[PDB]
Design a protein around this ligand. Sequence first.
Ligand code: FMN
Length: 108
Amino acid sequence: KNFVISDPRLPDNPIIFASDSFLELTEYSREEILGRNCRFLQGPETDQATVQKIRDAIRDQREITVQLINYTKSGKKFWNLFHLQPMRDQKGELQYFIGVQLDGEFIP
Ligand SMILES: Cc1cc2nc3c(=O)[nH]c(=O)nc-3n(C[C@H](O)[C@H](O)[C@H](O)COP(=O)(O)O)c2cc1C
């Protein structure tokens, strides 16, 4: 339900699609999201060490799961259990990343 799709073939891996649940959770309108990198959800309290692990996963085009603090439009802190999956065409060329979010502090 709660997910976005980025196009890594376009500059800085912009969000091309965002699910209604995502717009609801993050409090942003679709118009504010389309063409942005998803890093705008990060903020002061976001562990940079965890952000680095996401950068490595995108570089190596591997799937990853991490928990990190994210901010809504209004600046409300929420824990994001974030799941990144690379997505390839028939020829095995990377086409998209899908990013699934789950809201809550799962690991204390
Ligand atoms: C499909 C997709 C969804 C993403 N969703 C989130 C997210 O919900 N929260 C977040 O903090 N970062 C998310 N990211 C990570 C950022 O977009 C960015 O790649 C990350 O912060 C590391 O790159 P940077 O060092 O250039 O910021 C997502 C990335 C992709 C490709």
